[PDB]
Amino acid sequence: FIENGWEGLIDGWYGFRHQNAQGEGTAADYKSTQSAIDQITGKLNRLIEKTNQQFELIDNEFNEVEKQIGNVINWTRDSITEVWSYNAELLVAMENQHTIDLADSEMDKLYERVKRQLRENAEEDGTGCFEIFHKCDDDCMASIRNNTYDHSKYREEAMQN
Amino acid sequence: FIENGWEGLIDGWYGFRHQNAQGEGTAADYKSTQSAIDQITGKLNRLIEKTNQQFELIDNEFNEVEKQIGNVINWTRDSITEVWSYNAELLVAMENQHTIDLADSEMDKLYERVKRQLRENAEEDGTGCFEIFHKCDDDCMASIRNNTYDHSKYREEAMQN
Amino acid sequence: FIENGWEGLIDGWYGFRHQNAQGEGTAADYKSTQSAIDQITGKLNRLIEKTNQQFELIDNEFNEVEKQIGNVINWTRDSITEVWSYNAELLVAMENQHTIDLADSEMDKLYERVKRQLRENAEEDGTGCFEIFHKCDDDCMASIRNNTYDHSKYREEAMQN
Amino acid sequence: ICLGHHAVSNGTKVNTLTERGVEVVNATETVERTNIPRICSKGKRTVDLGQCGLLGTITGPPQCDQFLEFSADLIIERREGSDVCYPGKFVNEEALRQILRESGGIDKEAMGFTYSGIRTNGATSSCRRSGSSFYAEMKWLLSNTDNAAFPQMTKSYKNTRKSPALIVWGIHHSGSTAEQTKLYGSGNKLVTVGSSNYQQSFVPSPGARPQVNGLSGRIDFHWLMLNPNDTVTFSFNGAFIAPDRASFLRGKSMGIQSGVQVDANCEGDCYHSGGTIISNLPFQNIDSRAVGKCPRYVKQRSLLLATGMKNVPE
Amino acid sequence: ICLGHHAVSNGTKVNTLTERGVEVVNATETVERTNIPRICSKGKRTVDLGQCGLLGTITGPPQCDQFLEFSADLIIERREGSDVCYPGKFVNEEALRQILRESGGIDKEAMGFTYSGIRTNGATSSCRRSGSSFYAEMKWLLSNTDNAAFPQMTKSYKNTRKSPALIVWGIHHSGSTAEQTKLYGSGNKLVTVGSSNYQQSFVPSPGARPQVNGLSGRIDFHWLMLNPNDTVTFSFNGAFIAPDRASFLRGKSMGIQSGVQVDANCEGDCYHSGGTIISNLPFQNIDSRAVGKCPRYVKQRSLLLATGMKNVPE
Amino acid sequence: ICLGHHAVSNGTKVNTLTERGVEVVNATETVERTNIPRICSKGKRTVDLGQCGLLGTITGPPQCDQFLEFSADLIIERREGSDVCYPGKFVNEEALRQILRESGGIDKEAMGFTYSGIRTNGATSSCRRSGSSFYAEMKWLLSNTDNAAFPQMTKSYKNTRKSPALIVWGIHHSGSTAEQTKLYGSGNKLVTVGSSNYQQSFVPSPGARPQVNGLSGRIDFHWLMLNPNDTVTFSFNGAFIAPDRASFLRGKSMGIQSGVQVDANCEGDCYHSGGTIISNLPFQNIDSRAVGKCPRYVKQRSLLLATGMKNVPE
Ligand SMILES: *[C@@H]1O[C@H](CO)[C@@H](O)[C@H](O)[C@H]1NC(C)=O
Ligand SMILES: *[C@@H]1O[C@H](CO)[C@@H](O)[C@H](O)[C@H]1NC(C)=O
Ligand SMILES: *[C@@H]1O[C@H](CO)[C@@H](O)[C@H](O)[C@H]1NC(C)=O
Ligand SMILES: *[C@@H]1O[C@H](CO)[C@@H](O)[C@H](O)[C@H]1NC(C)=O
Ligand SMILES: *[C@@H]1O[C@H](CO)[C@@H](O)[C@H](O)[C@H]1NC(C)=O
Ligand SMILES: *[C@@H]1O[C@H](CO)[C@@H](O)[C@H](O)[C@H]1NC(C)=O
Ligand SMILES: *[C@@H]1O[C@H](CO)[C@@H](O)[C@H](O)[C@H]1NC(C)=O
Ligand SMILES: *[C@@H]1O[C@H](CO)[C@@H](O)[C@H](O)[C@H]1NC(C)=O
Ligand SMILES: *[C@@H]1O[C@H](CO)[C@@H](O)[C@H](O)[C@H]1NC(C)=O
């Protein structure tokens, strides 16, 4: 229903874009953007990792070792390489899936939060926007953003409309 | 709340089943079924995979190799077999979990989409069905399916009821 | 919106806490708590696992084997140890993520279920609570819990308010 | 208006992170179990060694006369194969087998060893051709007249080609010290092999062995790999089976051990002793020792992947 | 009406894909750290070798007299064990140890070697019983009268049973060439061992060694494995320790090395030198070299799995 | 009021469980490909052996005269390195190399071998110093007067230190039996080495070898590791290169083989022949045989991890 994104929203990941009679407005929501950013940062902190396991030389590039023990070594190294290639591919794919679903989840939860702020004074449009049945000025807009808009001190007027 | 599924819905994965005064109707929704089908197809494309890594013979079935090197080889092969059995079981289980949750997610998102199409002209029943407060004919039904039903050109009549 | 949890809810994982004119009340919901508990129990049944793969001795603690074959053995064992440490860490982390998201999902689905029970006779407050526009007594409360509250035999009175 | 999903009367139970036995609408197998009981060699140069052993192709017993300069992408060893006609064995035999399996075939070249003062036509009844013969690529160096001594000889070979040369020689162990004196004379015999990577000595040791094909004599086959322009030197005085032609690796191939027939109608890159594994599944439960480009072997015989949604019928 | 979830005052921090230190309501351990400092052998036929070495059970030093035909499901090696009474060692000792650990015990059978023209009762003070003895399963072949020569002998043994036979012989290395002439006579001695899979020669080499139990003499123990109906042949002329009885593998077992006591009260399938690992957890951080049916060893000492929901207290 | 998310005109395609090529806002690399073409040794005691071979540091050819008692945390082998000045080789050479790479350096101690009845100053032109010399840590034992015999000698060494002692001796193989009689006399020569863990014999074998530096003679280097308070014994009568000083391991280090320069400006714990891998990424696609503390090698050259949300532009 949010059929596309806002390329002009350069200030944050999630933002508001209102359009009443006073004018225009697009301002990022820092507390959700910072949540998704914090979670991605955590993923990067867990994946960017350094091992304290030292592995020594068991081969020899200058003078080849015995052919049989060399074939066993190459066989084992190839097996471990297969395992780590599989683990890397699956890890990247799973982490990407969870990242995308995570961002989408953050967006949806923000949407339903703003929806629960406007109880009967607004109605869902069907494309990610909210229809207000009373011209909400820009002070009311800033109150909607920082979660202070009164849910009943604008009710009756909007319920009539 | 959708306490069971429709065994008679042989035309698609997700469908509509309406019941107004004009008659009956059950028609699959191709654009969601095709989404879930596309995602499962992608899973099968990523898992049905061919390796370009060739592994050679390090054992010998006709003349057994040295007992010690044979025990090292068997030990390594058994370890790698444990690793791959674990990876296979965990992969299958995780993929199945994500598949089930994915289908359920598609169903729920379709539900809330149809809900957002009917703004105040309908009310949620509590079992996955929608109560219309005005007898919607079959042209209105086809308009509901292909997402063209007008959200306000049926409003007042339903709001009275 | 459920800004914290109830430390006094010692009877179950998810519960109700009502406050009408008759008095107070906090009672756990057994059928959702038992669902989350069943799923965690299943995770523990899949992870608490016993292997039927026997591994034999290829080293020797009392008389050290040949240095080269010992270095190959130690190299392989260290590689497998790296693989299993990675698999253990990733498994634990992923399972924990899915457990947390699972409990949160159960809570949300319960919330929307209770919401769909109260169709127009109540309105969302915005912090996980529901506002009833008619004083619902404790028989009505028990009817809300065991999913028997009538969605229309209390409607008109609440719609007036 | 009511919206929902589809369902079936008979679902397929699968396993997840949570449960074991969740019915889904559709599911597919991930662990391969179907095996083709043939060696699928469609489009590959295949050499079925049969009664010829892989190592014999270097020495050349009668059963390997048509495998002295073979060329293949796929090499098949059979259980009835034999590396020797005169009873004996190779030192480091399995390493040489693994070398020859991925060699892509072999190319022989005469080493140009001439002799003066000894006899060079040693034969036996176990290596039968038109009559009593010997290994096609070797020469059984003996003494001239039924006994008398063996002169201390030193023969040298320089690898003039750009690929490593496979050199194989043999030390003869007769059934008795009297037979060793009959063939090469009395006294301690010594064979010395030297190069750049190689340094090694060999002393014959006569004695009675169990009779295999008649004898009761043995022949130790040894081998080194000369580098380009590197020179190998043999210093021998008896009990020496001399190489007549050296071997060179043609390219690349794969070696398998099987007992099933060859089929040029099916194609496959995963082989085991029981046949070919042709599958797109990521896993297999057929043979843990399968070679080639195979799905990973797992101990589970079946792991169902859910291709459908949860099945909740009425 | 307000609905929510439960919480606790003191949660358990766990790690996820995103964070490190998320308090949850309940959590459980997945990495095993508790070790039972005993060898749990409840329900298993156990043989504690003690002062007897595993290889000695084939040759039979005095400390292995009660282990010549043992039978077990679990074999325990001790640090005080010794394979020899007369100073010496085995060739390919660790391979033979790994063979005997999973053998399920051994069954001896007389090989039926008779002698004529030599002495057969060689003994020593290091292999002490009622007096000066030798290995129970071996025979120290010497010359008749304090010196004089050793006749070139050829003895043969055919494995008449359906399982491979373990054959062990010994080459004696005296402290000097004069002692070798005293025991077997002058001249170069040679021992030849041949069969179907085996071919090998051995030459004694006298000389001074460090004194171990008195000598200053050594004995090389060698072994091959005869196949059913296959025949082994020895051709010797001195410095030869002859096998009197061959060994046969009983079935299957497991071998461990430990220094803790045996306990028939606890049951366990995962063993290490420090005891038994009895756990249902999938991982363990106790011993990476543990054997049996063990949880996979990991380097992490603890990995908490969340069994509860997120803990958000007031 | 409309709420949404951000987007960009040019995203980065990544792969997931479902699709291959999903544009996201931001992504980062997980597979390391950038390589520093130097050996980053900042903060480590480094020994670049150069023309000196690693094993030579135990025997002491002229090129290893400044590496006889080295000490390092990082040992670098070069392709131009040589273990020998007189042509020869070590037995179990790679095991000794792996021992010396993690040794942390070596510490020599005089073994205190005195001789009476032979000559001890054997030299050659290939081991050139101020004139014709030999291995610095060895002594070429010969006969007194150009020929005459070699007395049967027995020399003993007891390891009085708390760490295992590395003992290396040599068996000389001349170009002919006449040269062996010239250096040590006629007759069969025998070298016996014995201890607690060791038991082994050696017989020289003269013969013609390819000329390397002039000869056409070879020297077999052998080695054992004495335990504390354990005694090793040599019983020789010719063709013996005696050890003059034993080696002791200093501590711990790492050994690499490389052909790039040393750089004390960069720091790194992952090395390969082409340089140093300095990265925080979990994977690398540079060298599968890299050693040290490295990211796991994978065959994929790139695996993009999505650091941003789904990119859906207008
Ligand atoms: C093992 O692989 C390396 C290349 O990674 C190759 O140079 C070497 O020859 C192989 N070992 C054997 C025994 O062929
Ligand atoms: C390794 O396992 C195979 C069966 O997979 C068995 O035939 C062989 O004997 C084993 N190796 C040793 C040394 O026992
Ligand atoms: C292998 O590791 C063990 C400790 O786990 C150590 O005692 C042993 O010496 C190592 N092997 C070699 C050849 O160093
Ligand atoms: C069910 O899964 C199988 C897997 O091979 C597939 O071939 C088939 O098309 C699937 N059927 C449906 C209706 O999706
Ligand atoms: C080998 O020797 C020939 C001598 O004719 C020389 O031309 C060639 O460059 C040499 N090649 C190598 C690799 O040593
Ligand atoms: C908490 O987890 C432990 C794990 O061993 C379990 O035994 C216990 O029953 C759990 N408690 C609750 C209240 O779930
Ligand atoms: C072994 O030899 C006996 C001869 O009595 C024969 O009956 C039996 O079939 C043979 N078995 C095998 C496996 O060679
Ligand atoms: C994009 O990802 C890179 C990864 O290295 C990071 O450095 C950068 O800060 C990220 N940019 C934004 C806007 O998140
Ligand atoms: C080594 O021998 C000395 C004899 O002076 C003795 O004092 C010491 O305790 C011994 N140590 C060991 C480990 O054998």
Automatic annotation (TrEMBL), chains D, E, F:
Keywords: Calcium, Clathrin- and caveolin-independent endocytosis of virus by host, Clathrin-mediated endocytosis of virus by host, Disulfide bond, Fusion of virus membrane with host endosomal membrane, Fusion of virus membrane with host membrane, Glycoprotein, Hemagglutinin, Host cell membrane, Host membrane, Host-virus interaction, Lipoprotein, Membrane, Metal-binding, Palmitate, Signal, Transmembrane, Transmembrane helix, Viral attachment to host cell, Viral envelope protein, Viral penetration into host cytoplasm, Virion, Virus endocytosis by host, Virus entry into host cell. Ca(2+) binds at E69, D107, K108. It is a single-pass type I membrane protein. Glycans are attached at N26, N229. One of its GO terms (cellular component) is host cell plasma membrane. The keyword Lipoprotein applies. Palmitoylated. In natural infection, inactive HA is matured into HA1 and HA2 outside the cell by one or more trypsin-like, arginine-specific endoprotease secreted by the bronchial epithelial cells. One identified protease that may be involved in this process is secreted in lungs by club cells. The keyword Magnesium does not apply. GO terms for biological process: clathrin-dependent endocytosis of virus by host cell; fusion of virus membrane with host endosome membrane; fusion of virus membrane with host plasma membrane; viral budding from plasma membrane; virion attachment to host cell. GO terms for molecular function: host cell surface receptor binding; metal ion binding. Disulfide bonds join C40-C266, C52-C64, C85-C127, C270-C294. It comes from the Viruses. It is found in: Host apical cell membrane; Virion membrane. Binds to sialic acid-containing receptors on the cell surface, bringing about the attachment of the virus particle to the cell. This attachment induces virion internalization either through clathrin-dependent endocytosis or through clathrin- and caveolin-independent pathway. Plays a major role in the determination of host range restriction and virulence. Class I viral fusion protein. Responsible for penetration of the virus into the cell cytoplasm by mediating the fusion of the membrane of the endocytosed virus particle with the endosomal membrane. Binds to sialic acid-containing receptors on the cell surface, bringing about the attachment of the virus particle to the cell. This attachment induces virion internalization of about two third of the virus particles through clathrin-dependent endocytosis and about one third through a clathrin- and caveolin-independent pathway. Plays a major role in the determination of host range restriction and virulence. Class I viral fusion protein. Homotrimer of disulfide-linked HA1-HA2. Belongs to the influenza viruses hemagglutinin family. This is Hemagglutinin. It comes from Influenza A virus. The chain holds residues 21 to 334 of 560 of the full protein.
